[PDB]
Design an enzyme around this catalytic site. Structure first.
Site, PDB file in Angstrom:
ATOM      1  N   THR A  34      -6.458   4.037  -4.237  1.00  0.00           N
ATOM      2  CA  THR A  34      -5.268   3.261  -4.586  1.00  0.00           C
ATOM      3  C   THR A  34      -5.103   2.925  -6.073  1.00  0.00           C
ATOM      4  O   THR A  34      -3.987   3.030  -6.581  1.00  0.00           O
ATOM      5  CB  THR A  34      -5.154   2.006  -3.732  1.00  0.00           C
TER       6      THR A  34
ATOM      7  N   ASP B  49       3.269   3.947   7.027  1.00  0.00           N
ATOM      8  CA  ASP B  49       2.578   2.677   7.167  1.00  0.00           C
ATOM      9  C   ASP B  49       3.583   1.551   7.383  1.00  0.00           C
ATOM     10  O   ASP B  49       4.798   1.726   7.187  1.00  0.00           O
ATOM     11  CB  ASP B  49       1.667   2.407   5.942  1.00  0.00           C
TER      12      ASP B  49
ATOM     13  N   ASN C 127       1.273   7.877   2.386  1.00  0.00           N
ATOM     14  CA  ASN C 127       2.144   7.204   3.336  1.00  0.00           C
ATOM     15  C   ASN C 127       3.486   7.872   3.540  1.00  0.00           C
ATOM     16  O   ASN C 127       4.237   7.430   4.396  1.00  0.00           O
ATOM     17  CB  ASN C 127       2.356   5.737   2.941  1.00  0.00           C
ATOM     18  CG  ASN C 127       1.081   4.938   2.964  1.00  0.00           C
ATOM     19  OD1 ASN C 127       0.932   4.019   2.177  1.00  0.00           O
ATOM     20  ND2 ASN C 127       0.143   5.284   3.864  1.00  0.00           N
TER      21      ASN C 127
ATOM     22  N   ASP D  88       0.847  -1.196   0.000  1.00  0.00           N
ATOM     23  CA  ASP D  88       0.000   0.000   0.000  1.00  0.00           C
ATOM     24  C   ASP D  88       0.878   1.239   0.000  1.00  0.00           C
ATOM     25  O   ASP D  88       0.633   2.191   0.751  1.00  0.00           O
ATOM     26  CB  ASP D  88      -0.940  -0.001   1.226  1.00  0.00           C
ATOM     27  CG  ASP D  88      -2.042   1.099   1.160  1.00  0.00           C
ATOM     28  OD1 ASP D  88      -2.511   1.473   0.035  1.00  0.00           O
ATOM     29  OD2 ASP D  88      -2.447   1.578   2.265  1.00  0.00           O
TER      30      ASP D  88
ATOM     31  N   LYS E  52       1.921   4.650  -0.948  1.00  0.00           N
ATOM     32  CA  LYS E  52       1.211   5.766  -1.596  1.00  0.00           C
ATOM     33  C   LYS E  52       1.750   7.128  -1.160  1.00  0.00           C
ATOM     34  O   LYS E  52       2.324   7.256  -0.084  1.00  0.00           O
ATOM     35  CB  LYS E  52      -0.319   5.654  -1.397  1.00  0.00           C
ATOM     36  CG  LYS E  52      -0.763   5.613   0.077  1.00  0.00           C
ATOM     37  CD  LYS E  52      -2.300   5.378   0.250  1.00  0.00           C
ATOM     38  CE  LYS E  52      -2.838   4.351  -0.738  1.00  0.00           C
ATOM     39  NZ  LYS E  52      -4.174   3.830  -0.315  1.00  0.00           N
TER      40      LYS E  52
HETATM   41  N1  LIG Z   1       3.852   8.948  12.688  1.00  0.00           N
HETATM   42  C1  LIG Z   1       3.085   9.923  12.253  1.00  0.00           C
HETATM   43  N2  LIG Z   1       3.340  11.170  12.642  1.00  0.00           N
HETATM   44  C2  LIG Z   1       2.585  12.178  12.219  1.00  0.00           C
HETATM   45  N3  LIG Z   1       1.547  12.002  11.409  1.00  0.00           N
HETATM   46  C3  LIG Z   1       1.225  10.772  11.005  1.00  0.00           C
HETATM   47  C4  LIG Z   1       2.003   9.692  11.417  1.00  0.00           C
HETATM   48  N4  LIG Z   1       1.498   8.607  10.865  1.00  0.00           N
HETATM   49  C5  LIG Z   1       0.444   8.973  10.146  1.00  0.00           C
HETATM   50  N5  LIG Z   1       0.271  10.300  10.220  1.00  0.00           N
HETATM   51  C6  LIG Z   1      -0.802  11.089   9.524  1.00  0.00           C
HETATM   52  O1  LIG Z   1      -1.939  10.210   9.291  1.00  0.00           O
HETATM   53  C7  LIG Z   1      -2.206  10.143   7.853  1.00  0.00           C
HETATM   54  C8  LIG Z   1      -2.825   8.754   7.545  1.00  0.00           C
HETATM   55  O2  LIG Z   1      -1.836   7.715   7.398  1.00  0.00           O
HETATM   56  P1  LIG Z   1      -2.084   6.148   7.743  1.00  0.00           P
HETATM   57  O3  LIG Z   1      -2.688   6.544   9.030  1.00  0.00           O
HETATM   58  O4  LIG Z   1      -0.615   6.056   7.471  1.00  0.00           O
HETATM   59  O5  LIG Z   1      -3.077   6.161   6.458  1.00  0.00           O
HETATM   60  P2  LIG Z   1      -3.480   4.766   5.760  1.00  0.00           P
HETATM   61  O6  LIG Z   1      -2.360   4.367   4.886  1.00  0.00           O
HETATM   62  O7  LIG Z   1      -4.831   4.944   5.183  1.00  0.00           O
HETATM   63  O8  LIG Z   1      -3.536   3.734   7.005  1.00  0.00           O
HETATM   64  P3  LIG Z   1      -4.907   3.031   7.494  1.00  0.00           P
HETATM   65  O9  LIG Z   1      -5.601   2.333   6.211  1.00  0.00           O
HETATM   66  O10 LIG Z   1      -4.495   1.795   8.436  1.00  0.00           O
HETATM   67  O11 LIG Z   1      -5.839   3.957   8.175  1.00  0.00           O
HETATM   68  C9  LIG Z   1      -0.864  10.499   7.205  1.00  0.00           C
HETATM   69  O12 LIG Z   1      -1.056  11.010   5.891  1.00  0.00           O
HETATM   70  C10 LIG Z   1      -0.366  11.603   8.141  1.00  0.00           C
HETATM   71  O13 LIG Z   1      -0.973  12.879   7.831  1.00  0.00           O
END
Ligand SMILES: Nc1ncnc2c1ncn2[C@@H]1O[C@H](COP(=O)(O)OP(=O)(O)OP(=O)(O)O)[C@@H](O)[C@H]1O
Length: 263
Positions: free
Chosen positions: A145, A143, A127, A122, A124
């Protein structure tokens, strides 16, 4: 892998950092230590042992897990630099060479995951997060489409770690022109585009992009998983390892294409 009675006994939950398909990410303070973290709140609707072994400078470290009756709380290294596309849009000057440096980091992190036996699947632009607001900040994969999804997967054929190399090629493509290589209004035709891997370096957007960059992309965005460059191989390509990435300011066009096509 502890359990929390009230997760709030341990973390002070402050603002939403962002939102995923069916999970949100929240800025919190560890009350015990006063350290700021990012907490992924996953509804309950062996791999976590592996998730703690992941330690790489371009990968968001998982620092802990706690579980409540309703949810899982993944306590993550907090990243403060914002999303990749946002910086590119807001950036004053942008070059092929900036794109190459970002791609280098993603390749490095992805190969490191492939060596642990983790396949991302995944990958993207979402991510991909900057570590700080520092202009020279490294990027990081958050992490653990359609477009981004490799042909094999969409063909429901057998897939390997090679799926991630495809995604990296799609990302590189967007990083140089600001629009996705695959788009149509009809999902059916789009998937057929993806399955046939038919895309163009279409003018004018690609006129000022090096041939080495185009060569690099062709080799990652390759339909045949057995032909597709791997991470190791992409790392050693001149556009990544040598000195071929150009120095021209491509910011205006890429930035405008990103605004037309994303967020
Ligand atoms: N460690 C982090 N620190 C700060 N911001 C974060 C962090 N991880 C994620 N984010 C924020 O959360 C957003 C969503 O990412 P994730 O939560 O990575 O999305 P996802 O790939 O759809 O995962 P999921 O399908 O499990 O919800 C990121 O684009 C970012 O803005």
């Amino acid at each position: 892998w502890k359990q929390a009675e009230d997760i709030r006994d341990i973390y002070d939950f402050r603002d939403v950092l962002g939102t995923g398909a069916f999970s949100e990410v929240i800025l919190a303070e560890d009350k015990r230590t006063q350290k700021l973290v990012a907490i992924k709140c996953i509804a309950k609707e062996n791999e976590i042992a592996v998730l703690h072994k992941i330690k790489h400078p371009n990968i968001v470290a998982l620092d802990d897990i706690y579980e409540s009756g309703g949810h899982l709380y993944l306590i993550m290294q907090l990243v403060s630099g914002g999303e990749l596309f946002d910086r590119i849009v807001e950036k004053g000057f942008y070059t092929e060479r900036d794109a190459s440096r970002l791609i280098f980091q993603v390749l490095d992190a992805v190969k490191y995951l492939h060596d642990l036996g983790i396949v991302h699947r995944d990958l993207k632009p979402e991510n991909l997060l900057y570590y700080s607001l520092d202009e020279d900040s490294k990027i990081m994969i958050s992490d653990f489409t359609p477009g981004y999804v490799a042909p094999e997967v969409l063909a429901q054929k057998p897939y390997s770690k090679a799926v991630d190399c495809w995604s990296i090629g799609v990302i590189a493509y967007i990083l140089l022109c600001g629009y996705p290589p695959f788009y149509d209004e009809n999902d059916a035709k789009l998937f057929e585009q993806i399955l046939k891997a038919e895309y163009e370096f279409d003018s004018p957007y690609w006129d000022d992009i090096s041939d080495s960059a185009k060569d690099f992309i062709r080799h990652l965005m390759e339909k045949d998983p057995e032909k597709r460059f791997t991470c190791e191989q992409a790392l050693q390509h001149p556009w990544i390892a040598g000195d071929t990435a150009l120095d021209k300011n491509i910011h205006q066009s890429v930035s405008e294409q990103i605004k037309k096509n994303f967020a």
